Structure 1
Amino acid sequence: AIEALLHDPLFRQRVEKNKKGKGSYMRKGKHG
């Protein structure tokens, strides 16, 4: 059970978007 659970998606690698980074450009801001 341990092994397959690990394989399952909920435990996929997470990466975050950047605010001053390379892939930063926000077309519309969170707030107007």
Structure 2
Amino acid sequence: SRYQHTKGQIKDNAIEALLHDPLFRQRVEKNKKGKGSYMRKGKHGNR
């Protein structure tokens, strides 16, 4: 099962190259309560 290498024709280091493409992104939690937190409509919504 392939991954479409955003980098393409990988010549030198495969690991490093991959780590520098969308597959190993910087992933950020959308936490509640604080900063970058507010949701207009919740997961289940207002009742």
Give yes or no for TM over 0.5.
yes
Q: Deviations over 1:1-25 (max 9, x none)?
A: 2221121211011111121111111
Which structure has more helix as a fraction of its residues? 1
Q: Normalising by structure 1, report the TM-score.
A: 0.63
Match for residue 19 of structure 1 among 28, 32, 35? 32
In our comparison, the structure showing a higher alpha carbon Rg is: 2
Overall identity of the aligned pairs, in %? 100
Task: Output the aligned Cα RMSD.
Answer: 1.2
Q: Normalising by structure 2, report the TM-score.
A: 0.53
Which structure has more strand as a fraction of its residues? 2
Count of aligned residue pairs for this structure pair: 32
2:15, 2:39 → 1: CA distance?
40
Which runs of 5 or more structure 1 residues have no equivalent in the other structure? Answer: none
